[PDB]
Design a protein around this ligand. Structure first.
Ligand SMILES: [K+]
Ligand SMILES: [K+]
Ligand SMILES: [K+]
Ligand SMILES: [Mg+2]
Ligand SMILES: [Mg+2]
Ligand SMILES: [Mg+2]
Ligand SMILES: [Mg+2]
Ligand SMILES: [Mg+2]
Ligand SMILES: [Mg+2]
Ligand SMILES: [Mg+2]
Ligand SMILES: [Mg+2]
Ligand SMILES: [Mg+2]
Ligand SMILES: [Mg+2]
Ligand SMILES: [Mg+2]
Ligand SMILES: [Mg+2]
Ligand SMILES: [Mg+2]
Ligand SMILES: [Mg+2]
Ligand SMILES: [Mg+2]
Ligand SMILES: [Mg+2]
Ligand SMILES: [Mg+2]
Lengths: 98, 60, 95, 283, 290, 128
RNA sequence: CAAGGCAAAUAGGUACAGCAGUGAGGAAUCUUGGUCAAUGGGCCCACGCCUGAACUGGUAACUUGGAGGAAUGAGACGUCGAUUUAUCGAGUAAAAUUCUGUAUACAUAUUGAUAAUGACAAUAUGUACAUUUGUCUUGACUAAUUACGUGCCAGCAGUCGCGGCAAUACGUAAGAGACUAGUGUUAAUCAUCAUAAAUAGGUUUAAAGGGUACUCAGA
RNA sequence: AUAGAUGAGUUUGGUGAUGGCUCUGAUUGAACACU
């Protein structure tokens, strides 16, 4: 079962993730089939900006990710959300309005 | 670019260096990445990129 | 620096001197450092191949500095120029 | 009781070293004194290091008022006053900060500026141009060009700089292309033909002015192409920036310097000596 | 904690030259021997002497183990080329003769005839030796704590370091708390004005202020660290030089790291109070730390 | 040697050189614990003269070696557990090992002021 | 299925080379913690449950990186150490004065995470504090000296070596050289070593030409 | 990646060679001693 998931890398209190295409039943950090992108959870701030806004830098190969989703790849709950923001899949969870 | 580059950053006035004016030695990066496989043959146009390939394997 | 490479042998003591680009320094032994530093040489490399006799190493080194290939004589012998690329590139010798 | 060593110190410090207590005369007052080139030497044992002049407080304004108001290209201002293009760009950046401080009603260090500027030699630009500030045609000594090569060629060959570049290497360029203001060569080639002076200046401005447009056009398309690969999706809290990249550019064996990812087959180098852990670039 | 190596920083017996504006340092610098004795000393004894002399000044606050890896055998240099020569000649005349150039008569024959020979075609000032030896300690000029001391913002390399560690410097408009940050060509480091005035200002001894407040020009303010009105240090004129690689602005106390120190034919840009003979021996030591 | 002679494997490794402390060099150990079997005196060689304090120790591995007792005065005797380290007494044949003075049973020189680390002696603790 | 160890009797289990931990061996290597909040996996229509993987806290200078304080400081006409008794040092060193607020402590905010869920911590800002020296070396190689004691004795030593009554080499005292929260020693690896030489060696007298050349294989 | 190639002590009445040993450089998942 192919899956688009995250591989945690980095140091203590410094998480850094790697979007990968790996079989479900394999180690989390084993060499996958491909590395689609990277993900950084800790949000950053622009250098010369004082508005206080924050952003999350994400590198993603949308072209390669779309092909694997079309053949039956199952993205995890975390990667599903990211793909939704880009506009590839529909949101899995939404804030209840009532 | 919502915030204009202030005069503090070095990108305020860009003056490119002339060719072959530096010899910075990049350190050898250790490690490798998994070579992404190839989806098409090396020669010829495959059938996957034709008119109705997707509509033939994933019909409604 | 010296002209090209030189190799002299004095009774089992072979010395090999090499010309190095500017800024290389005197990456040589202690005895070769004194001679080069006293003659005016600033960039050079030397190796003792066979023996390291304190005496014959000096006789060989001093004999190698006097056996440098003269570029002007080599040119007249072959009938061809021996243009030094570094002098034409910068339009004059850069000491 | 003071020791003899201290006694000899204060004595020297009261008669010979007293001229350095307070700065009365304008200009350098170093120990090495003036050299054969008219430049003060701070350390007598090192005759090579000299106290080079610094742009005057007014000269900095002349450069600023020229690039901003008159809108002349930095290359023309550099060649006009013989100031390095890297220095002209820095003077404008520092001057822009002054305008900010003066605009924000911040107290300038005028007492520290006037007192220090009297200790350093200066070169006022404009009318009184006694000497050029520095060398604007300094070329980097490429390691390939440092080799001693005596190439055998025919007795009657016209060995030019182009031929010398190929001898050092096939990818090396001659010194005619490594200049920061390569338009000066073309300007000098017009004088050899006895072209009217101020007409050659006209071509120089157009040449330099046109060269800046090309540079500004290149960086414009670049920055425009860098933001086209970023997809900014606004959310409740943050703004996610999805950057696109070809994941297949990992070389022929997976090893590539410009590849994106955390390399799998590497352990932590934190225990290695000389492992720099400081920010390398404040962007 | 004062280590055993700082016990006699400004000794008048050893006579070490330190990177500071102390009056004791000014005496050791002014009365330094013109020529160190290397007559009977061996090669190791020569290298050790030069190492101790140069290290007392260059990066004195840097561990010997750290500088050994910082040392670079690559010494940057540049060559000046005027466009006038480039336009007229293309470098062919330099190869005339047999490749090296057209030979000229010896010196004992030229003036013998009242007429001098025609000038040799070449760039102006194209026979001066370039001082590569003085660039041995160039990498140290890239640190953030050294650059502040070379811009006349601090009275010492140590005092310049605290400005960085204590969060008073701002590189590229961003706080930098690392005195080891290697400045890049184009970086703009800015020190706090209040700390620059105290470092370079004169000492504030209150006994003289007793009869100062009662009995453009500045006003007397008794609520500031430096002595008011601000005046330069007692011996700042003897160490008042700014290197050509740095462009400074005294008003806002900001400077720019234009480029790295490069050796030019006839001069160097690394401030070093030592002759090429000593800088040469220091270079040889660090080649193999022996 | 011709190229064909090098194909057949003529470049064999140089003969091994006996280590200074084979008992330690063999198992890649910096030190070894042992029980003293005899504490005596050894006579130096031709040029030197005197009496070197040596101890016949049986290492944990099983081998019996002759170690050297550095310093002035020792408190070890038969059936004493002492630590052994590499070295050698250059003027005593067979003595190819030393004994750490701050070891388990061997005590460091009490009246030592110079190079205390070499002899396992604590600081005098006078002003402390 | 069989055997031995442990356990078991009419039983027929167990093997911690799963995590933490104990004993043993050894010169020598850790906590019988918290949580599934993050990431990954298994089951599940869904909700959800489980996860000693994993994420986090703890221990150990084992290693690396950083901090561990800067400026002023001249007659306290004091103190000490030597010794030519008046010369040379400790010494800008100290005290003292003027500033900073680094590790860190506390406080606030943000953040790791969002549909929701925070075990624990990071980051930013504000205020506040100026806290140790230690170790080796000193004949040459190899940077750095005298005095006293001992007298081929006691001891030093990586190599050569030192000590036999006026020892710069041993043991003390002082000075000097150097590294520094590390410093030496021991063990090991690479290089030094062209010191197994493919690149690139050599074999008359120094390690090394076979007793001989016809000759298959092979060059 | 174009700067990267280095020696020193020790055999002899003495000289020049041959030839080992040790030192100088870097390091360890290290141990011990003094801290
Ligand atoms: K030899
Ligand atoms: K011997
Ligand atoms: K024979
Ligand atoms: Mg002592
Ligand atoms: Mg078991
Ligand atoms: Mg276990
Ligand atoms: Mg045990
Ligand atoms: Mg979980
Ligand atoms: Mg959960
Ligand atoms: Mg999950
Ligand atoms: Mg579910
Ligand atoms: Mg703090
Ligand atoms: Mg010595
Ligand atoms: Mg000793
Ligand atoms: Mg001998
Ligand atoms: Mg002694
Ligand atoms: Mg440390
Ligand atoms: Mg036979
Ligand atoms: Mg025979
Ligand atoms: Mg004989």
């Amino acid at each position: 079962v192919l899956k688009l998931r995250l591989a945690r890398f980095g140091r203590t209190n410094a998480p850094f993730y790697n979007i990968v295409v790996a079989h479900a039943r394999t180690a989390r950090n084993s060499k996958p089939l491909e590395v689609i992108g990277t993900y950084d959870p800790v949000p950053k701030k622009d250098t010369y900006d004082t508005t206080g806004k924050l952003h999350k830098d994400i590198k993603l190969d949308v072209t390669r990710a779309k092909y694997w989703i079309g053949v039956g790849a199952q993205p995890t709950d975390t990667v599903w959300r990211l793909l939704s923001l880009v506009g590839i899949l529909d949101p899995k969870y939404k804030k209840p309005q009532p | 670019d919502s915030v204009s580059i202030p005069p503090d950053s070095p990108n305020y006035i860009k003056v490119p260096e002339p060719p072959q004016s530096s010899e910075v030695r990049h350190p050898f990066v250790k490690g490798h990445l998994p070579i992404p496989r190839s989806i098409f043959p090396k020669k010829g146009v495959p059938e996957k990129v034709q008119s109705g390939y997707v509509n033939r394997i994933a019909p409604k | 620096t010296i002209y090209g490479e030189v190799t002299t042998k004095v009774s089992g003591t072979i010395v090999r001197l090499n010309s190095r680009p500017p800024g290389f320094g005197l990456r040589v032994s202690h005895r070769i450092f004194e001679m080069c530093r006293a003659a005016g040489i600033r960039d050079l490399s030397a190796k003792f191949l066979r023996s390291r006799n304190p005496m014959n190493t000096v006789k060989a080194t001093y004999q190698a500095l006097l056996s440098q290939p003269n570029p002007e004589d080599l040119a007249i012998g072959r009938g061809k120029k021996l243009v030094d690329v570094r002098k034409v590139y910068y339009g004059g010798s850069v000491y | 009781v003071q020791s003899v060593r201290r006694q000899k110190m204060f004595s020297w410090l009261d008669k010979k070293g007293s001229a350095y207590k307070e700065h009365t005369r304008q200009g350098p007052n170093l120990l090495g004194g003036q050299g054969k080139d008219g430049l003060a030497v701070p350390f007598p044992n090192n005759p090579y290091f000299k106290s080079q002049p610094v742009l005057s407080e007014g000269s900095r304004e002349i450069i600023y008022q020229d690039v901003m108001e008159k809108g002349l290209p930095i290359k023309a201002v550099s060649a006009k006053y013989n100031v390095d293009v890297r220095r002209v760009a820095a003077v404008i950046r520092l001057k822009e900060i002054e305008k900010r401080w003066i605009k924000e009603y911040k107290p300038l260090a005028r007492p520290y500026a006037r007192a220090v500027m009297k200790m350093l030699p200066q070169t006022v630009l404009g009318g009184p141009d006694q000497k050029p500030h520095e060398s604007i045609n300094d070329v980097h000594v490429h390691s390939y060009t440092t080799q001693q090569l005596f190439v055998p060629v025919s007795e009657s060959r016209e060995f030019t700089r182009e031929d010398a570049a190929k001898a050092f290497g096939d990818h090396i360029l001659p010194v005619d292309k490594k200049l920061r203001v390569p338009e000066l060569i073309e300007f000098q080639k017009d004088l050899l033909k006895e072209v009217p002076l101020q007409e050659a200046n006209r071509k120089f401005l157009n040449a330099t002015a046109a060269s800046e447009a090309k540079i500004a056009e290149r960086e414009a398309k670049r920055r425009q192409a860098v933001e086209d690969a970023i997809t900014r999706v606004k959310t409740d809290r943050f703004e996610f920036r999805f950057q696109e990249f070809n994941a297949e550019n990992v070389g022929h064996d997976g090893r590539d310097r410009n590849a994106v990812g955390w390399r799998y087959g590497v352990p932590f180098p934190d225990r290695k000596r000389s492992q720099i852990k400081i920010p390398t670039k404040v962007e | 904690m004062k280590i055993r190596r700082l016990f006699k920083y400004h000794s008048l017996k050893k006579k070490p030259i330190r990177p500071t504006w102390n009056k004791y340092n000014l005496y050791n610098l002014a009365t330094a021997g013109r020529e160190p004795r290397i007559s009977g000393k061996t090669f190791f004894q020569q290298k050790w002497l030069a190492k101790s002399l140069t290290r007392a000044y260059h990066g004195e606050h840097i561990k010997e183990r750290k500088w050994a890896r910082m040392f670079s055998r690559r010494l940057p240099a540049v060559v000046n080329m005027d466009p006038a020569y480039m336009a007229k000649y293309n470098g062919s005349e330099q190869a005339a003769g047999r490749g090296s150039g057209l030979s000229e008569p010896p010196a004992y024959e030229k003036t013998a005839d009242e007429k001098p020979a025609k000038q040799v075609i070449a760039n102006p000032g194209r026979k001066v030796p370039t001082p590569y030896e003085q660039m041995t300690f160039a990498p140290l000029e890239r640190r953030l704590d050294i650059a502040i001391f070379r811009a006349l913002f601090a009275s010492s390399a140590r005092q310049a370091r605290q400005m960085v560690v204590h969060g008073a410097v701002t590189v590229n408009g961003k706080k930098m708390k690392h005195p080891g940050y290697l400045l890049n060509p184009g970086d703009l480091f800015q020190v706090d004005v209040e700390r620059v005035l105290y470092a370079t200002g004169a000492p504030k001894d209150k006994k003289l202020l007793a009869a100062a407040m009662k009995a453009e020009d500045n006003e007397i303010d008794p609520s500031k660290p430096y002595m008011t009105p601000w005046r330069p240090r007692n011996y700042m004129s003897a160490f008042a030089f700014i290197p050509r690689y740095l462009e400074v602005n005294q008003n806002i106390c900001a400077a720019v790291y234009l480029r790295h120190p490069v050796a030019r034919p006839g001069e160097s840009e690394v401030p070093s109070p030592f002759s090429p003979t000593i800088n040469q021996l220091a270079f040889n030591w660090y080649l193999r730390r022996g | 040697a011709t190229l064909n002679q090098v194909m057949r494997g003529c470049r064999k490794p140089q003969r091994a050189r006996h280590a200074v402390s084979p008992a330690l060099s063999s198992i890649k150990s910096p030190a070894l614990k042992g029980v003293c079997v005899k504490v005596g005196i050894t006579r130096p060689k031709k040029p030197n003269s005197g009496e070197r304090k040596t101890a016949r120790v049986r290492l944990s591995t099983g081998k019996v070696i002759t170690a050297y007792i550095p310093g002035e005065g020792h408190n070890i005797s038969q059936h004493s557990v002492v630590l052994v380290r590499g070295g050698r007494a250059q003027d005593c044949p067979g003595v190819r090992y030393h004994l750490v003075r701050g070891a388990l049973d061997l005590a460091g020189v009490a009246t030592r002021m110079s190079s205390r680390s070499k002899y396992g002696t604590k600081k005098p603790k006078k002003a402390s």
